[PDB]
Write a protein that binds this ligand. Structure first.
Ligand SMILES: CN1CN([C@@H]2O[C@H](COP(=O)(O)OP(=O)(O)OP(=O)(O)O)[C@@H](O)[C@H]2O)c2nc(N)[nH]c(=O)c21
Ligand SMILES: Nc1nc2c(ncn2[C@@H]2O[C@H](COP(=O)(O)OP(=O)(O)OP(=O)(O)O)[C@@H](O)[C@H]2O)c(=O)[nH]1
Ligand SMILES: Nc1ccn([C@@H]2O[C@H](COP(=O)(O)OP(=O)(O)OP(=O)(O)O)[C@@H](O)[C@H]2O)c(=O)n1
Ligand SMILES: [Mg+2]
Ligand SMILES: [Mg+2]
Lengths: 148, 736, 284, 734
RNA sequence: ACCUCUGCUUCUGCU
RNA sequence: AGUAGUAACAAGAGG
């Protein structure tokens, strides 16, 4: 390296490298290019964390009730604006779910609200609610030696 | 009508609305679980690109080492590591000839640096592979561990405090028959074999890169240990010193300075061109830059750059490339397995991959393991080729620039020529010539020359157009740089340092963006409003007259009801927002100073408060931020230290581990350092120098402080005697 | 300049505050904030979180809105990607059975009836509850908490277009842009062709884009956006008469295309790119 | 008990074997490492982590002593602290309610030192409170990236001088061996030492703030106007993409900044005036209308002692007495007799570096005075013929010698540069050759001194000598260097003619405008010319954009005038600034070319092209001169770098963008106006369309003369294109 | 059962 | 189940 002196080194190896090693330019004309191809499969489905356009609100105007600012109080006040309840039925199944459990979570929820007292509401860990929240679904963790 | 935002581009040039193509209002991608798959991927690909080279078994580690240098020339456009020593040398010689005296100067500066650098320079890294534990640790902790284990095994030249002496210890440590370390079962002494130790010394730990934008799929990064880091540091310093004097280098200049340099290069180029020449620019990127760089080539570069220099320095700088030629990669955390039938899950280690049954793995991973098996050595993978991500950014830059440097008319004497700018693997190449055929030939000459030195232009990532517009590392040029405000969107929020630091950072971000990224005044005003709301919610410091309920409401309400001049309350104390465009550069405490009840002000700014955790001048009013793109940056901010300058609690997970003992060691160390500073306050500003023990210095200082205090009358004669007495008792107690 | 900025800001604050995208922002900020704090403080509790926003009519009155409820699962969230499971339960008048592919993960219940009267008589409408298991993480909750930054992405671009015209005209074009209410930017497509909108519309469209980027953040979106940007840039170079060339256009198309996998937002963005390309082709 | 509590603590620690082991076996040096020993990691996502922790009851870590200093529970029953130790320390976990408690009800200290310690911060607010706002204007302006100062009120110290000073001020007894040479250092120390006595703010913050204050800091920023630090500080407020908010910060200017701005203003005025029909009248007009930060330029010129060629031309015009000198290296240089002339040439340094450099060639004599030293100098072309030098100290005589050796421009100093010295910054920006050399040889002259030589001195004793040592020596000296000891400061009445030539009462030529530096600098302070002769928007880039924007916006009127009355168009006053961007030697030919081409467009009907007209129009504005030169471009000097504007089609400087339908000048839109035959590219020829090998080989441009009326060719016209031209059968007179 | 600890800490690199 | 997406979470560790 210390005595190195260049003398056509690059030129020589450029002359020994196949023409297949190149960066040929292709003229780019957006008039002759194709549209992107989209994947195929089942139709895409909603994955927001909350409803968007299909949402419906229960509203109270100029709220004044005791606890204005406390979420669950505001929530009770909003609920109170709806008279037209009826026995919940399932009308569109979660095909991979235990649809029964969802019905029961709602019924549990509504009841627990109507009965609630205080500012926060924590629900009982029923079997239907556990299921819906993946309670115990983590596999039990073991040493490899013991399950190999 | 269906709304389509992309249709704006029918009227507005893409660069002028580029901001909209950056979706940086959402969470960036993260890996979950192991990176071992990504590590195997890079190991495999790196060998694949060099596969037609020569295999050898390393005499010291037993590692299988692939050498593609001076290998067969590329035969197609696939990424190649077949770099040719003589071609690299020609390029570096070309760089020497274009810049007489540059190598000599950069060497001279590097030598001075080697003489002056303190061992503690290595504390400046982030997470570092710690061979004494076979786990990552903070850089300073990793340094201390190496120093301690070295001295217990008889290496202590580093006691000099000089980095170069620590470097000597490192090389000398490889002669040891069996390096002793201690593991925690209580405490057990473990003896590494000479081979074990060397393998750990040559290790880069690996993990996956999180929070990287713009990519579907993840990749692996690496962290070297302390044996490597001191040597790499000096190679990269030398390379930096060179890059600073190359008109074609994009490093280490940052944002505005980088843009100024690029604009100058275009201006230069155009002045040097004739009016009859065409000019095209490649917006350029390279395929798998790091995997196709080669330590053997870096060794050549270092020897050639340092030609004529003292042999000790040449050999010292050659260490980093040699170590990289002999490196191994830890394979990461392994994999997890699951049994549907038995609802269970388990962790296997990377080390298990040497000999685990292959039935557990998907086909892809089984193939990876099969390929990697012949490389595995005491739990690691041999990786002679490649450099791994970002290890020699500057030296690799020197290689790319050397190709740019070739494009001078008086060297080529062709119907074309080129110049440009390069930063790592990113480049803008400007090619000039009389006809389009000249441009094509020039582009082919540049591309093929790059191939001869293991630089592989990414065909699918690069494009070409007539000079006037181009992109360079997310800077868009349309006859001059335009703004890209969206790059910065993630920095608009609450930084999470503390209440004082965050107010200052938040207002500064707005201001900086008004100056640099065309953040208009109305949006800047709205940015102030949005920041203040987020700060108030984050820190639960809603204005004192509001009726939100938090754990802080009652105490802030009292402060409010009791305050006379409410306009003087800091926002974090439930006060109003004072900020508008005109005062963004004024620290809140200054801005409100004249409006503060004197008692609040005297409390807020009480220097005796227990909240502010001062440490070091050099790290005062410094935050770390992670930009959307690129490395972590230190951020200076302007703020008065108050009770709002507090420190959040530390992680406690280590309490549940065998490493909990470390917490105790830290506490002891800190206690010793704190008391030291009660005797040497200047040590918080600059680092104190000396071979004297901490205790001896404190004793000498107490005595002579007590004597001056006596004469000057700050202290009684009784007090004074007790001080000298306490000193004598300490003197004595120090003899068991 | 502060006075100038506030006048333009009032234009902006209007357009954006009344935009439906801003409703989603507030839902997202409220939900993620509540879920993060609950996740941290109540790790063992199945805690209930009402989905609330508060707004004012243009007619000036405050209103509190309830959309439904979230039930939080346990939440020993350690790594930043660690998941909290939760149930969402959300009111709607939309019958899902008309578009079931939109609702694969949901169990929709019928829970009541809602009145509508007029004159000759009235009509009762069923009230549905859209129920589903879902999940999120500390990283996703943090970003959701910050969704107000979407306002800046839109308004900065809008303000840059106002400023660009203002420089050439040598005066503040804010009022002309907001009031001359002439259709001066292509922002959509009808069956007849390309439709133009005012700067107000551009603001809301760019805001919606930004908000959707945040709701539907993905690696697919990241890769799609970065790779498709190169193709946008190549088109622009052609339209600027700068004689652009590629080295492996096929490989560039494959790099874009592999990022379009299953995400509805990325699928639509890909479709938009195609529409843009066709419209540009037609104009040449 | 000053010292009492800390020694007792130390006693207790040494009673523990572990702590004693550490304190006896850790060098002061090694403390630097163990100080950072930790299991704690630098948070990698602090934003997320804070949002998480702020939900928790006890997220804050506070000193153990909090437990003694505040209640455990507050009035509302909030727990404020707990006894849980934070991992890795003796700090304890506390509530944010503890911070509020402290701020409402904790101990009240006095804050007298706060303003002084945080002066750098408070000064910001002072400047703003006393600032004045003018109007906002809307326009496009190029904001060019340069390095600018960012901290008003620094004391221009290096980091090592600052450290030294701060060590003396804050930690005097830990200073070590060496102490402060500089007197600047010493008076700062005393001032600061006096300001900060009895100060109880943490010394960490005091050192931090002193370091921020005392050291000059810079940054690269896009900046259109005043570059002074007090203006940089409010760049977000005064500059936008399309606007300027006129503003004056409260407080005094620096004398340095004013002097610097005065020179820039005066040069700008001189350069603008030289291109007017009556330079002196135009210069006086501008002098009388111009202000620097609302101060009339006339008053500054009367009261300001700056000696500079353009400044002095302005002083002469105004009847102000001048000291016929300039500044260099802090020394003032009066030319007694002789003269020389500016010529650039290539120059290899001993650094090993090529460099264009303006070098003065000719015989000259200089009286030189500084505040501590003085000399007589005789000069040739890079010739130090002789330097007779005096002053207070040896030191001060030395420092002037260095300066004069460098000022000579001698080869021996050229080829005595050693180590790192470059003539372009990191950003590729050309730097001042002579100031670079001066700063170098003031760092270290040892090579220079040894490379110079010596000389044997006579017995006319009194003509003393100085040795390559720096030593006082009787028989030997350096080469041309001697030592010895009314009216050097004295200001003279001069006269000035219509073309700005300045002469004494005796009528000898003292200053000519061609001796004024061509460097386009950026003013530290705002200049308002308030003049019909100057664009309202300052700067060279702005001359370009303003001129083209103005043509376009007035295009309807200007077009009719191009058709009906060209000569009145060409002579319009709005084109004069633009003339200053054209090299002096090219103005006439560029004009002749342009007028000819424009006449051709008229003669050859159907070949009107408004863009071509707009583009070339400003080049019409000089008495024409016909020639044989075809131009493929015109050169413009912008910031001392030539840009070339292509005659045919678009260039980096000037291009029409079809897609936007705008003209773009230096990257800025300046708005829009809204057959194959090209009449206004070549003098005498027409372009018909694309090349045709029918009519033979492709000729250069500079090979077209050898054709004849009606005869054609193929031409490499520029930017890679080949075209079919025809020599015209009749040509146009203009 | 139940008890205890942990919520970035066996995994976040480089100029 | 659900989140997600090239490998994880769906509590871990210890008693
Ligand atoms: C070696 N020099 C330098 N010099 C004068 O030195 C003065 C300042 O030095 P300079 O390096 O030219 O700076 P200047 O061009 O003013 O700086 P700027 O870059 O701001 O334009 C000029 O006015 C110039 O005339 C000289 N003047 C004469 N007559 N003869 C000389 O030999 C020399
Ligand atoms: N050493 C180092 N280089 C980095 C880092 N981040 C980015 N780079 C380099 O800087 C380049 C510019 O990054 P960007 O253009 O902002 O992003 P990108 O997604 O890689 O680039 P595009 O292809 O333009 O979308 C990268 O392509 C790398 O070459 C980093 O953390 N360390
Ligand atoms: N976070 C990052 C990103 C990039 N790099 C460095 O920058 C180089 C170029 O980055 P990039 O172009 O993104 O990747 P390549 O390795 O070139 O691979 P490819 O372009 O084929 O994806 C990398 O090889 C590596 O040396 C790094 O160190 N850290
Ligand atoms: Mg790359
Ligand atoms: Mg890259």
């Amino acid at each position: 390296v210390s005595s190195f002196k260049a003398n056509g080194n690059i030129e020589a190896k450029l002359g020994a490298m196949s023409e297949k090693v190149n960066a040929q330019i292709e003229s780019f004309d957006p008039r002759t290019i194709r549209e992107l191809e989209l994947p195929e499969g089942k139709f895409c489905t909603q994955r927001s964390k909350f409803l968007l356009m299909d949402a419906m609100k229960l509203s109270v105007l100029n709220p004044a009730h005791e606890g204005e600012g406390i979420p669950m109080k505001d929530a009770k006040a909003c609920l109170d604006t709806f008279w037209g309840w009826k026995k919940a039925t399932i009308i569109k199944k979660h095909e991979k779910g235990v649809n029964t459990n969802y019905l029961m979570i709602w019924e549990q929820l509504l009841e627990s609200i109507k009965e609630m007292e205080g500012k926060f509401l924590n629900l009982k860990k029923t079997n239907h609610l556990k299921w819906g929240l993946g309670e115990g679904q983590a596999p039990e963790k073991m040493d490899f030696e013991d399950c190999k | 009508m269906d709304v389509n935002p992309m249709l704006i581009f029918l009227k507005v040039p893409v660069q002028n609305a580029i901001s909209t193509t950056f979706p940086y209002t959402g969470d960036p991608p993260y890996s979950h679980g192991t990176g071992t798959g990504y590590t195997m991927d890079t190991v495999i690909r790196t060998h694949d690109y060099s596969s037609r080279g020569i295999w050898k078994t390393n005499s010291e580690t037993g590692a299988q080492q692939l050498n593609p240098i001076d290998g067969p020339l590329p035969e197609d456009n696939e990424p190649s590591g077949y770099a040719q020593t003589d071609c690299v040398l020609e390029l570096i010689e070309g760089l020497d000839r274009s810049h007489p005296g540059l190598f000599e100067t950069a060497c001279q500066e590097t030598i001075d640096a080697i003489q002056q650098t303190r061992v503690d320079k290595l504390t400046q890294g982030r997470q570092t592979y710690d061979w004494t534990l076979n786990r990552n640790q903070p850089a300073a902790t990793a340094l201390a561990n190496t120093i301690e284990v070295f001295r217990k095994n008889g290496y202590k030249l580093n006691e000099s405090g000089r980095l170069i002496d620590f470097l000597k210890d490192v090389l000398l440590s490889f002669e040891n028959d069996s390096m002793e370390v201690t593991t925690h079962f209580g405490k057990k002494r473990v003896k590494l074999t000479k081979k074990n130790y060397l393998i750990r010394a040559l290790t880069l730990n690996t993990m996956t890169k999180d929070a990287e934008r713009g990519k579907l799929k993840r990749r692996a990064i690496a962290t070297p240990g302390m044996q490597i880091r001191g040597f790499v540091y000096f190679v990269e310093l030398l390379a930096r010193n060179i890059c600073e004097r190359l008109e074609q280098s994009g490093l280490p200049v940052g944002g505005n300075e980088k843009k100024a340099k690029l604009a100058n290069v275009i201006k230069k180029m155009m002045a040097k061109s004739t009016d009859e020449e065409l000019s095209y620019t490649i917006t350029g990127d390279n395929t798998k830059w790091n995997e196709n760089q080669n330590p053997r080539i870096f060794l050549a570069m270092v020897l050639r750059i340092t030609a004529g220099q003292p042999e000790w320095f040449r050999d010292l700088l050659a260490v980093a490339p040699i170590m990289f030629s002999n490196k191994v990669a830890r394979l990461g955390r392994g994999y997890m397995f699951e049994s549907k039938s038995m609802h269970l899950r388990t962790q296997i280690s990377a080390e298990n991959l040497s000999d685990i049954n292959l039935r557990y793995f998907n086909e892809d991973t089984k193939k990876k393991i099969e390929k990697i098996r012949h490389l595995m050595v005491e739990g690691t993978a041999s990786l002679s080729p490649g450099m791994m991500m970002g290890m020699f950014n500057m030296l690799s830059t020197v290689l790319g620039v050397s190709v740019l440097n070739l494009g001078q008319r008086e060297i080529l004497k062709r119907t074309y020529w080129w110049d440009g700018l390069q930063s790592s693997d990113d480049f803008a190449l400007i090619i000039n010539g009389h006809f389009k055929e000249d441009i094509q030939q020039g582009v082919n000459h540049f591309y093929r020359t790059c191939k001869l030195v293991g630089i592989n232009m990414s065909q699918k990532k690069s494009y070409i157009n007539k000079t006037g517009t181009f992109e360079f590392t997310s800077f868009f040029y349309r006859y001059g740089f335009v703004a890209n405000f969206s790059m910065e969107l993630p920095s608009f929020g609450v930084a999470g340092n503390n209440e004082s630091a965050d107010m200052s950072i938040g207002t500064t971000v707005i201001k900086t963006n008004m100056i640099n990224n065309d953040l208009g005044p109305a949006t800047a005003q709205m940015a102030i409003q949005l920041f203040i709301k987020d700060y108030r919610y984050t820190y639960r410091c809603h204005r004192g007259d509001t009726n939100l309920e938090t754990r802080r409401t009652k105490s802030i309400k009292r402060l409010w009801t009791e305050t006379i001049s409410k306009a003087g309350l800091l926002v974090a104390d439930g006060g109003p927002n004072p900020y508008n465009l005109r005062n963004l550069h004024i620290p809140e405490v200054c801005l409100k100073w004249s409006l503060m009840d004197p008692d609040y002000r005297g409390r807020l700014c009480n220097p005796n408060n227990p909240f502010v955790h001062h440490m070091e001048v050099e790290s005062t009013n410094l935050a770390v931020v992670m930009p959307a793109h690129g490395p972590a940056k230190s951020l200076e901010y302007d703020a008065v230290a108050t009770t709002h300058s507090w420190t959040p609690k530390r992680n406690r997970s280590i309490l549940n581990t065998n490493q909990r003992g470390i917490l105790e060691d830290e506490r002891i160390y800190q206690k010793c350092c704190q008391v030291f500073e009660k005797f040497f306050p200047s040590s918080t500003y600059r680092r104190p120098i000396g071979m004297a023990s901490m205790l001896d210095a404190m004793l000498s200082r107490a005595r002579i402080d007590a004597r001056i205090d006596l004469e000057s009358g700050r202290i009684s004669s009784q007090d004074f005697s007790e001080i000298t007495n306490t000193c004598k008792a300490i003197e004595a107690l120090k003899r068991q | 300049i502060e006075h100038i900025a506030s006048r333009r800001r009032n234009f902006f604050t209007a357009e954006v505050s009344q935009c439906r995208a801003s409703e989603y922002i507030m839902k997202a900020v409220y939900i993620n904030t509540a879920l993060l704090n609950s996740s941290c403080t109540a790790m063992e509790e199945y805690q209930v979180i009402p989905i609330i926003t508060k707004c004012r009519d243009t007619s000036g009155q405050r209103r509190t809105n309830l959309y439904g409820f979230i039930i939080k699962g346990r939440s020993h969230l350690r790594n930043d990607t660690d998941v909290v499971n939760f149930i969402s339960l959300e009111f709607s008048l939309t019958d899902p059975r008309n578009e079931i592919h939109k609702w694969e993960k949901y169990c929709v219940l019928e829970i009541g009836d809602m009145e509508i009267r007029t004159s000759i008589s009235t009509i009762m409408k069923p009230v549905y509850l859209y129920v589903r298991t879902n999940g999120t993480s500390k990283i996703k909750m943090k970003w959701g908490m910050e969704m107000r930054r979407c306002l800046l992405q839109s308004l900065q671009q809008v303000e840059s277009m106002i400023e660009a015209e203002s420089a050439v005209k040598e005066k503040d074009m804010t009022e002309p842009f907001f009031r001359n209410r002439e259709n001066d930017w292509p922002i959509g497509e009808s069956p007849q062709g390309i439709e133009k909108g005012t700067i107000g519309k551009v603001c809301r469209v760019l805001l919606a884009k930004s908000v959707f980027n945040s709701i539907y953040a993905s690696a697919q979106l990241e890769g799609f956006s970065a790779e498709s940007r190169k193709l946008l840039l190549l088109i622009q170079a052609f339209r600027d008469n700068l004689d652009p060339g590629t080295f492996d256009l096929k490989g560039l198309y494959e790099a874009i295309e592999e990022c379009i996998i299953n995400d509805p937002w990325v699928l639509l963005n890909a479709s938009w790119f195609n529409s843009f390309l066709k419209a540009v082709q037609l104009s040449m | 008990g000053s010292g009492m509590e800390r020694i007792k603590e130390l006693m207790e620690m040494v009673k523990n074997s572990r702590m004693r082991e550490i304190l006896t076996t850790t060098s002061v040096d090694h403390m630097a490492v163990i100080k950072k020993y930790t299991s704690g990691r630098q948070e990698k996502n602090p934003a997320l982590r804070m949002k998480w922790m702020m939900a928790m009851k006890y997220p804050i870590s506070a000193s153990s002593r909090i437990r003694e200093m505040i209640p455990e529970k507050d009035e509302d029953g909030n727990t404020l602290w707990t006894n849980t130790k934070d991992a890795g320390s003796n700090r304890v976990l506390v509530s944010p309610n503890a911070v509020t408690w402290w701020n409402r009800a904790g101990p009240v200290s006095d804050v007298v030192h706060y303003p002084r310690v945080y002066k750098m911060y408070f000064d910001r607010l002072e400047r703003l409170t006393h600032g004045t706002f003018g109007p906002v204007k809307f326009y496009n302006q190029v904001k060019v990236r340069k390095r600018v100062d960012i901290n008003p009120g620094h004391k221009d110290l290096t980091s090592r001088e600052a450290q030294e000073v701060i060590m003396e001020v804050v930690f005097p007894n830990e200073v070590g061996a060496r102490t402060l040479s500089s007197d600047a250092q010493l008076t700062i120390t005393k001032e600061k030492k006096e300001e900060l006595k009895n100060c109880k703010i943490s010394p960490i913050m005091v050192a931090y703030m002193l370091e921020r204050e005392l050291v000059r800091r810079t940054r690269f920023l896009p900046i259109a106007g005043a570059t002074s630090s007090t203006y940089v500080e409010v760049l977000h407020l005064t500059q936008g993409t399309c606007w300027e908010q006129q503003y004056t910060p409260g407080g005094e200017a620096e004398n340095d900044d004013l002097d610097q701005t005065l020179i820039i203003a005066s040069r700008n005025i001189v350069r603008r005036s030289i291109v007017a029909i009556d330079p002196l009248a135009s210069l006086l007009s501008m002098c009388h209308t111009t202000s620097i930060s609302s101060e009339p330029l006339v008053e500054i010129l009367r009261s300001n002692p700056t000696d500079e060629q353009a400044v002095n031309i302005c002083k002469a015009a105004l009847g102000i007495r001048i000291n016929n000198s300039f500044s260099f290296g802090g020394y003032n240089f009066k030319r007694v007799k002789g003269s020389s002339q500016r010529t650039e040439k290539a120059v290899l340094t001993g650094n090993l570096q090529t460099l264009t450099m303006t070098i003065f060639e000719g015989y000259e004599e200089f009286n030189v005075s500084g505040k501590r030293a003085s000399a007589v100098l005789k000069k040739g072309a890079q010739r130090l013929i002789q330097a007779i030098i005096g002053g207070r100290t040896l030191e001060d005589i030395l420092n002037l010698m260095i300066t004069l050796m460098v000022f000579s421009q001698e080869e021996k100093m050229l080829k005595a540069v050693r180590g790192d010295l470059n003539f372009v910054n990191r950003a590729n920006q050309r730097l001042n050759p002579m100031y670079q050399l001066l700063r170098h040889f003031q760092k270290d002259s040892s090579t220079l001194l040894k490379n110079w030589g010596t000389e044997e001195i006579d017995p006319i004793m009194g003509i003393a000598g100085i040795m390559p040592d720096g030593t006082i020596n009787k028989t030997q000296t350096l080469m041309g260097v001697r030592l010895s000891q009314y009216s050097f400061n004295e200001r003279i009445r001069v006269n000035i003619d219509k073309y700005l030539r300045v002469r004494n009462e005796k009528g000898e030529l003292l200053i000519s405008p061609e001796e004024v530096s061509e460097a386009q600098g950026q003013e530290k302070l705002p200049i308002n010319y308030n003049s019909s002769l100057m664009w309202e928007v300052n700067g060279p880039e702005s001359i370009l954009t303003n001129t083209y924007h103005w043509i376009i916006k007035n295009w309807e009127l200007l077009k009719t005038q191009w058709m009906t009355d060209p000569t009145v168009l060409y002579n319009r006053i709005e084109f004069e600034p633009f003339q200053t961007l054209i090299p002096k030697g090219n103005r006439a030919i560029y004009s002749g070319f342009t007028r000819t081409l424009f006449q051709q467009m008229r003669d050859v009907e159907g070949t009107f092209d408004s863009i071509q007209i707009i583009k070339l129009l400003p080049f019409s504005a000089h008495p024409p001169s016909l020639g044989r030169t075809q131009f493929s471009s015109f050169t413009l000097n912008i910031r001392g770098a030539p840009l070339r504007l292509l005659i045919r089609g678009n260039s980096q400087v000037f291009n029409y963008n079809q897609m936007e339908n705008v003209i773009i000048v230096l990257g800025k839109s300046v708005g829009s106006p809204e057959s194959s035959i090209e009449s206004a590219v070549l003098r005498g020829f027409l372009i018909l369309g694309k090349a045709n090998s029918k009519y033979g080989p492709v000729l250069t441009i500079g090979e077209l003369d050898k054709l004849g009326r009606g005869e054609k060719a193929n031409v490499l016209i520029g930017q890679g294109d080949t075209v079919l031209v025809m020599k015209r059968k009749r040509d146009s007179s203009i």
